Amino acid sequence: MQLNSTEISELIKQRIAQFNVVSEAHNEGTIVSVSDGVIRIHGLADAMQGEMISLPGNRYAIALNLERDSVGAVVMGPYADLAEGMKVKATGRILEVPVGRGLLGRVVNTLGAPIDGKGPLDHDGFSAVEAIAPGVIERQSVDQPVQTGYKAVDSMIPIGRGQRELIIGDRQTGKTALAIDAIINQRDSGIKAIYVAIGQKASTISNVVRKLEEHGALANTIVVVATASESAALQYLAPYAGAAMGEYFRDRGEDALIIYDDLSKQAVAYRQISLLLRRPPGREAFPGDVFYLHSRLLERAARVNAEYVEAFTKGEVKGKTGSLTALPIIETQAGDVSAFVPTNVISITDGQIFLETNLFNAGIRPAVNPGISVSRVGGAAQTKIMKKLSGGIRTALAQYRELAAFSQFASDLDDATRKQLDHGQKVTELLKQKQYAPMSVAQQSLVLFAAERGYLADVELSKIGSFEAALLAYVDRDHAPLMQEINQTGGYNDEIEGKLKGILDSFKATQSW
Amino acid sequence: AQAEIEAERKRAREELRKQVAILAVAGAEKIIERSVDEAANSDIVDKLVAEL
Amino acid sequence: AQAEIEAERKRAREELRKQVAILAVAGAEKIIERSVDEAANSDIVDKLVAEL
Amino acid sequence: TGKIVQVIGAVVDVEFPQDAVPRVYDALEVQNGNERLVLEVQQQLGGGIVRTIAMGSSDGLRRGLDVKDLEHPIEVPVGKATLGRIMNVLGEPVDMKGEIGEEERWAIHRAAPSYEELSNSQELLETGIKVIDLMAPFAKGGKVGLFGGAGVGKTVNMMELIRNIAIEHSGYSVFAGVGERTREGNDFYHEMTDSNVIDKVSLVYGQMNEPPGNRLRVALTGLTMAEKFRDEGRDVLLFVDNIYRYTLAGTEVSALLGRMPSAVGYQPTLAEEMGVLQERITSTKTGSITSVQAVYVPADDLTDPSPATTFAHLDATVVLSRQIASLGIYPAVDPLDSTSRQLDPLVVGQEHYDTARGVQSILQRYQELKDIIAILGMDELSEEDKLVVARARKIQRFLSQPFFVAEVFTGSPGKYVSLKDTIRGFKGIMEGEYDHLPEQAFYMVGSIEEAVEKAKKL
Amino acid sequence: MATGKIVQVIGAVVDVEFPQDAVPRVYDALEVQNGNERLVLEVQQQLGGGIVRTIAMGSSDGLRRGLDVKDLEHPIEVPVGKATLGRIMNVLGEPVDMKGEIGEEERWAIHRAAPSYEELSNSQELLETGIKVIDLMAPFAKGGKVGLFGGAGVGKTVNMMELIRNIAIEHSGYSVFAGVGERTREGNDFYHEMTDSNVIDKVSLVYGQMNEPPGNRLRVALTGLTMAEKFRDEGRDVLLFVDNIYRYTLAGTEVSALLGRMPSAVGYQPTLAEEMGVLQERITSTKTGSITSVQAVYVPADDLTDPSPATTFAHLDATVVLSRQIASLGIYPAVDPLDSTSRQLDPLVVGQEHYDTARGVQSILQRYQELKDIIAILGMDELSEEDKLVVARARKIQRFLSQPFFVAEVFTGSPGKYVSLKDTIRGFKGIMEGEYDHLPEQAFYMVGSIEEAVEKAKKL
Amino acid sequence: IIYDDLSKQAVAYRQISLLLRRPPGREAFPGDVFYLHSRLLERAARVNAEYVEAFTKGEVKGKTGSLTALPIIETQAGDVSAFVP
Amino acid sequence: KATGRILEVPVGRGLLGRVVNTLGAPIDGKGPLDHDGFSAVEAIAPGVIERQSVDQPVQTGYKAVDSMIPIGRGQRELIIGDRQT
Amino acid sequence: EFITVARPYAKAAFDFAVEHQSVERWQDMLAFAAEVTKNEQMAELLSGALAPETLAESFIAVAGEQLDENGQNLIRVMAENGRLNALPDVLEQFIHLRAVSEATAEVDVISAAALSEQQLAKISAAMEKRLSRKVKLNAKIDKSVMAGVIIRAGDMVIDGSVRGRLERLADVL
């Protein structure tokens, strides 16, 4: 079973053959103070900003304040063992993380050390944590779909390959659920997934990993973890490590989806770091450069043209464009979007999905507010059929909500207004969807066709859900080839509409909800 | 289940490597303690000063 | 499988206990830069048996 | 060896020879008059100066006093020897009985369990309280948080949870009083002794009268005892009387430690200070910890950073509202803000889930209608809206329940309600079976049969 | 030779100590080797003896205390003239389009004084945009300044794209686009759009994207202003487009705290109004040449009370306010007629017909805004029949102001419409009168000219 | 014992505190404002006979001491939700 | 000059019937104080084990208070309200 | 710490001493001025909030070994800003600037045992070419390193100790 017990010895012994006797030279400094994870270092004349500073043991610090006669650095780990007068060695290295294909299905901390207990990492080398985003001339327009599996999101608010779509809302409104369902849906789409957990408690991450493992999604996903207990440096650096890990795929011509969970907690950790460094607080006690943090973080998510990929790969990969899609999550306290961090993140991203408590309590789950939510890429990210169906739908629902506000006390409704009110109520009922139940493109297209072409009109509101379920089952058993054609091509034509109309008529005649 | 078993086996192997390394270097320390030579020390000094 | 690897670890101990013998390389062949006479000819087995 | 050089409230600076500077979190000792005062190291300043927090009253300290350096952090007794006794933050006995027969002492500052050790569990834990187990059920080994303002009834709910949960749990329990009333601690201890259940509970008490250091560090001692009981392989119950005071003590001491204020004047390390404490209260594959924590809400502002940070660490959250309490409805649980991780059709099953969501939707519709009702009155409503209002009011009344611990207030005897009875009653109310009964019929009734019996006499 | 040494590196702010007799002047450029890459620093303040505080025009990462800093005795100078056309340049005037060297003949400092009082002009020649609400409520003038106010996601970018497609193509003259703090994707899409439509040869692009350090975003707008001023001084008429003015003040706010200034107001830098005036006063049409400018202005949380949007209001001539409340209904362009205004909207310019139509529309919408409050609670039956008629016709006008742009077909899926001023006037006159009382409200939504609203009513 | 205007005390700590440059918290009171009242009020308690005997050194036996307190707080516009109340 | 006393105030039954400044100095014209020594102004309240439960009545005259809001010996009872109420 | 505030005074004093070719006397005066600052009663006097001129004139009284025209001016200038406590650091920075001006560097050598003169000579010769300055070695051999040698100049460190090799090897774990 473990005959390797002999060979591990040879593996250990060959290290001595690998070791080097050369006497190196390094710059040296001494710790003068230790407090709350921040250390002040005297000396280190050659220290660079952002440099990795090596401490006693295998611990590291990041140099941030290069003041005269003193260096301020933050410890990336448990700082309590440090003491005044300890000797500190300045390396030449910037922060780097393990990166590669082998990270899939592994749980690693912000430093890249595997914490899942599945043994050491297989990886393809190391990449810098801090890196610049591709310039203007290296990008390509976003025109490819990433399917969320949610009717509301995929219809009204399309997300494209290379888009930055903010998920924003109050606590306990389903922000995490939507993102993990988006991760689950990618199990067979070929898009790699990265889930970055900032400041969440470890048991929640255990539950998330268990849910991803209950489906086939975990083998396609990388999980980066920075629990609430870990030092602020690790939490604030966590998104960048995930960004670099996703950028690994983006430059080779593969698609990656990266979920930043609670960037607000990253901003909180950075505020703590800045205040401990005695930097001047700005508005809401946040440091001034907090916008630069999120802006330079989020600008990495982009779609690059084939030329950039060929240049990066030195001709190994030709003709393929890489893309990184980011879905940041922001928590608002009472729907107040005027707060500093929400305003910055809303300014940066290419759109937002608003989840709010009132709709969630009303039973509208997912509680996507069609009015304030918007996608700035729009129809270019959708397949042709989905675009055709949903384009009218989203504004129709918004204006229905307005009309329902207006009409609430009027006894007499014009028949056009009655049509709008009934249609809006039925469409609002239609978009509700249970958790962990993604729908394929063909099924969403079929249901939206059933809604748009008026077939839902006579059905009473409560039976609409059973109508949808029965239609899905009937079409799946009787009309599989058309579903396969729609899922593969996503095309739309006169014969496609005719077949859909025939399917709707046959279902509505023969079947029972 | 099979993947869990294989992962536990790999973890056990890495554990054994961690076990051996610490006591190995600790024994090498004593090898230095009981095999050091003043001529060897002078050789080390002269070697490093010859390449400083 | 866990009960298999539990006994296999007890089997593994003897290979770990044997291979701790080879420490003359790790310290001696690095620090003196030449091969060395086995001054610790008795202390090597002393370390082997005492440490594991 | 050390010399005191500054005394600023609870913070004392001590100078040591540069070769002997104590490590962070080391315990120091200084004679203060006719008593011995312990100091805990917080920060290492330059030049051998160290900044410490006094575990006691700092008045009477002069400059230049000799300070003795203990080489270990604060260590408290643990194990079965702590069972049935009241202990200080420093692990000293506070009851008049003799010394604690300790066999082992543990440092209070410990690392959280690793990600691998964590264990998942879904065993629903039943309570006698209709609203809690209906809207926000919680599982064995999970975290429960009671959020409320001043006077809404966090402590009463926690005592009722203690009474109900202790029935089916035979393991040990730990109660940690942090910055609360001493009178409540004495009453709890006496009622535990009278019921002869004291010998299963370890009580760590640092109350509001204590200086900030005791309130700041007291919770960690209770956590250390709970961790000792857990690592033995048992199933433990942990109750924190008020988690908010810990952060409040941190805020009080933060300014003197030389840290710039943040947000609403809280310490910048608020989130890390809360997380390091909360992460240690977790069930593990070796043993499980069930935790109930009361969370004070300053000025009823649920958006304050201290309540806001706590929300993410908890599995089930019960929010108490002053407005409901003013109606006389107890427990004053707000059902539109209370939420639990366990409200999931897979675990609770479909019927419970559907009943809970129906109640939630009905109450949301009532909240939506109330603004119109306030101005135009109920007469303007549509006939279905009036039925919605009538059912919502009945639901609101039915959520009330007489508590056994509240008999000293209401006089009426307490009730225990099964989950089956509450789900059946609420489903019956929503289906309209009881639309002929008055609202008062449902007020303060244990079960629906008691509601119909009260209706006969109105 | 290099004569200075870095002594502090905090964030984007670097302090350099020079000999006491060779202190660099304010706004002078500095040069330092950040490993392989050459880095440029801009001197902001002279303080103490020989020490200067500087903003790095690039990433501060990798800088060390002690690095030698060379003293370039001139401010940042950028290429100007026809050579810039069709090229994409950064804040420093370096090409970033991979097309090769700029090959300029002249270079200009980005910091310069505004035109004097005597040189200004008042040639308010009316300009048509082809948008109903903009042409009606807030007419443009040649050589004027236009601001598009709005929150995030209200339509500033698509409105500016439609304005470009309308005027700048027909303008028959040079144009400058300053991408201050823009998204890289949108800048790339705009460049490809200009290339495919084959008008890039007439326009020069300056880009400072969000990811760039605060110095680049702080100074990038001045490069565009310098190029536009070079074109103007030749005597040409040029169009200047600014992606977002607000981000310039945001970069200033970022750098201000480290520069030792105390905070003010909502945490803005104390010099907010001074910087805003300094930038805005160079965008003017002098007697030699005219600069027409359209500026998008971000409004934080749609609060027009915020000092950054509040201050810029005084510098513009026509102000178009986009409101999320209208955008929530999906009725784009979402221009608010009751907040938008223009200096040109007086009878002496527009003639009495246009002025009367605009005033009528404003009054009708104002009355409807009051009546809607009664309707919301009490219901529509409580109104006078004349108030009911006013509500109906106002609700019609509100929808008629909408218009599909054929730069937004990707979103809507519908063909764009172009409207002349005369047809807009006639349509709003007809809706104000009884000609169209019988058409439904939806009959006007995103239609275009009044002449086709009847067609949608028949189709509805 | 009936303390009058414990509110007028809290305003006074704020002055001594703000004069000492201590960072204010919610409203303008310093975070210690809870400790101020908590340590003053907690002295009002009823003590068992054993404490009385220990304190009196055996002079008084079998009697329990007590101290009742009636603090007075003044609310603006009947707002019971203010910080100090 | 630093006195050796931590802040202390005169105490004793002889204070009864006097109007006294916070330092213990009398402000009435009734001469010096007879007192039973001094006591510390800042002190720690009795701990958990020294308390006893409240079961004795302090009767205020008003019917509403003694009926609806009983006050016991050793209890702390907040009186809270707006101005001139 | 007074490190940052001592720098201008040390630089000014060194430039003045260079222009008057009196560096050694200045160094001795600075040492004397640094010693009186450490006096227990003078420490309390300096801690008290006396007026700058009276504190200065009281400080000059305790010093009769100062060049009055220049040393008194120095003390009065530091007194007017309350920097008198910085004198022990002004002295150190003055020494450092003098050593930089004379192109001379101190080097500390640590080894398991005393070195031979020839090894010391080779070390000094190598260091003089490394720094391009004159060097002055001092030997501080240590009980804990069992072999090798450590060379420290400024803050650049070259390690050849066997202890360093042992720890650097374990790091490969």
Ligand SMILES: Nc1ncnc2c1ncn2[C@@H]1O[C@H](COP(=O)(O)OP(=O)(O)OP(=O)(O)O)[C@@H](O)[C@H]1O
């Ligand atoms: N589509 C849905 N249908 C029904 N329940 C849902 C749906 N989406 C989420 N939920 C439920 O809502 C609750 C909160 O979900 P989730 O944890 O994703 O919220 P969140 O906004 O991320 O919360 P937090 O602030 O705690 O991180 C859970 O009980 C989850 O099961």
Ligand SMILES: Nc1ncnc2c1ncn2[C@@H]1O[C@H](COP(=O)(O)OP(=O)(O)OP(=O)(O)O)[C@@H](O)[C@H]1O
């Ligand atoms: N079931 C109940 N029946 C009647 N009254 C109740 C009930 N539950 C709570 N109360 C009321 O709650 C009041 C205060 O309760 P409790 O002491 O638990 O509050 P708390 O929230 O812990 O407050 P504090 O913040 O002051 O510690 C009591 O006076 C009691 O009248």
Ligand SMILES: Nc1ncnc2c1ncn2[C@@H]1O[C@H](COP(=O)(O)OP(=O)(O)O)[C@@H](O)[C@H]1O
């Ligand atoms: N005239 C319009 N027609 C259709 N959609 C529009 C229009 N204006 C804005 N939108 C919607 O608003 C979104 C954002 O518009 P954009 O102008 O990019 O935002 P911003 O004003 O923040 O730059 C677009 O994706 C588009 O769907």
Ligand SMILES: [Mg+2]
């Ligand atoms: Mg979440």
Ligand SMILES: [Mg+2]
């Ligand atoms: Mg309580």
Ligand SMILES: [Mg+2]
């Ligand atoms: Mg726009």
